[PDB]
Amino acid sequence: TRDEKITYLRKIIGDKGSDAWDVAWQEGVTPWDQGKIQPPLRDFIESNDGKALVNKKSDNARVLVPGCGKGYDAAYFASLGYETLGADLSSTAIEKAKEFWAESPELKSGKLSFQTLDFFKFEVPEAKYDLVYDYTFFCALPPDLRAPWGARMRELVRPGGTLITLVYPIDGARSGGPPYSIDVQKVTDALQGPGKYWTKVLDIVPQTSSPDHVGRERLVVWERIN
Numbered sequence: 571t572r573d574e575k576i577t578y579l580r581k582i583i584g585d586k587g588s589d590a591w592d593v594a595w596q597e598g599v600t601p602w603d604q605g606k607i608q609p610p611l612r613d614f615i616e617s618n619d620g621k622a623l624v625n626k627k628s629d630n631a632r633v634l635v636p637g638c639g640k641g642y643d644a645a646y647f648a649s650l651g652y653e654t655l656g657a658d659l660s661s662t663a664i665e666k667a668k669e670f671w672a673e674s675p676e677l678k679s680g681k682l683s684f685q686t687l688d689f690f691k692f693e694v695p696e697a698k699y700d701l702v703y704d705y706t707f708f709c710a711l712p713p714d715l716r717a718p719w720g721a722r723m724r725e726l727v728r729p730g731g732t733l734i735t736l737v738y739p740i741d742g743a744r745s746g747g748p749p750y751s752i753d754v755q756k757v758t759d760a761l762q763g764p765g766k767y768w769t770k771v772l773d774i775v776p777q778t779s780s781p782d783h784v785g786r787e788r789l790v791v792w793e794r795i796n
């Protein structure tokens with residue numbers, strides 16, 4: 571049962587820390603994997619507020635998708651014409667992502683790119699990213715990692731760039747391990763260490779949530795300011 575898979579996942583993470591992730595991937599305990607992007611992402615992009623960003627897209631607009639897993643989101647942004655990097659801690663995940671998207675034109679062209687990278691450790695390219703998409707990443711991090719997460723986000727997103735955060739699961743007081751209950755407030759506190767580094771341009775309830783996501787998810791768009 572999936573409740574067992576979560577319980578086991580919390581065990582490995584308690585024992586092996588961040589290394590538990592590649593373990594979980596190769597052992598096949600991946601109860602988060604949904605096979606596809608979350609509908610809110612597509613709807614936002616196809617919406618007019620989102621169309622604004624994609625027409626602002628420069629020739630080499632770069633997208634980072636941290637904790638990308640099998641990389642559905644990365645592959646989505648690549649299909650929009652963005653040079654896109656999907657990065658997961660787990661080389662298994664990165665291998666399973668290259669299989670899953672093996673037939674993607676963007677994988678062949680290089681637009682889409684999957685790499686085993688530690689979000690906290692890798693070398694932020696000097697150009698920085700025009701767009702970062704965080705889904706089921708922030709909520710995977712133990713609470714003591716949210717400030718580094720926000721700190722990293724500040725260096726990763728070029729000024730005037732965009733950070734999209736599908737904030738999920740908004741589950742209230744639930745004290746469980748991964749996935750942690752989060753809310754916009756917890757994201758805001760991490761990102762701004764009010765108004766210091768980001769502008770929250772857009773904070774909405776998606777009209778198109780997955781059914782198990784309904785009432786537990788908000789899409790928030792953040793602009794990087796100097």
Ligand SMILES: Nc1ncnc2c1ncn2[C@@H]1O[C@H](CSCC[C@H](N)C(=O)O)[C@@H](O)[C@H]1O
Pocket residue numbers: 588591592602603604636637638639640641657658659660663687688689690705706707710
């Ligand atoms: N420091 C870190 N850097 C990069 N990826 C990490 C990471 N810590 C955990 N992860 C990865 O984030 C994922 C947690 S769940 C995968 C969720 C994925 N975004 C999806 O929509 O399916 C795991 O794949 C885990 O390996």
Ligand SMILES: Cc1cc(C)c(S(=O)(=O)O)c(C)c1
Pocket residue numbers: 576601602603706709710748749
């Ligand atoms: C990191 C992580 C882990 C789990 C178990 C889940 S899920 O069970 O709610 O699908 C999600 C969404 C993210």
